[PDB]
Nucleic acid binder design. Structure first.
Lengths: 108, 108
DNA sequence: CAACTGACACCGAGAAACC
DNA sequence: GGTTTCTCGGTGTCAGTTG
């Protein structure tokens, strides 16, 4: 249980996702949030985390199921919203720039 | 344990629509399972769920607030974890107008 | 028309509570 | 011990909104 917390911390610390820490206390971080309708949407890099969380919890299986980034994007938002681990800073969410992003926070 | 004899009396009563058998030995029966959408009504669709709460004194009429979600959750959690009831997932028609589930009463 | 969202319902699997 | 319920961290559904 509670695999979402440690998984996301490991994803941010990995740096493999070009989602970064916004402070050095490792308590507030960035996260990309590009809309899948924009002409700047690469289905691979933009939906990389959303696919990974579906691959992690055994929801999407390669070469077996039809890909669907919308469902992958919806599952991660509901997980972050429902989990008592991450509180989103909606007033700091800069969701209207060249590369939109949200801001979250982790508590004890 | 009161779940076995109680449910057998509910199906045999025929008071709830959809709660019927599938053989003459009364060992395989359909249970009406809808999603709370469509023509869902708290009366006819969620009647058996209220009976279990009243039977086990979990809901007093006019005192506790009606909560059909947890009423169906209690009956589900007890029905699934019961060893007197086998869920036949292969005949479980979940993709129809009035979806039902097939349960078998194991003898003992 | 696809994509997105919040509000609400749903779920299984250990962990309790309760015979 | 054996049975019913409670917890919890996810997930699904819908109706309206949005790019």
């Amino acid at each position: 249980n509670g695999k979402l917390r440690q998984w996301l911390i490991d994803q941010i610390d990995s740096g493999k996702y070009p989602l970064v820490w916004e402070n050095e206390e490792k308590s507030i971080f960035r996260i990309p949030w590009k809309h899948a309708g924009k002409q700047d949407y690469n289905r691979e890099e933009d939906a990389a985390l959303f696919k990974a969380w579906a691959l992690f919890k055994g929801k999407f299986r390669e070469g077996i199921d039809k890909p669907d980034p919308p469902t992958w994007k919806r599952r991660l938002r509901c997980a972050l919203n429902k989990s008592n681990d991450f509180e989103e800073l909606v007033e700091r969410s800069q969701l209207d720039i060249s590369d939109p992003y949200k801001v979250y926070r982790i508590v004890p």
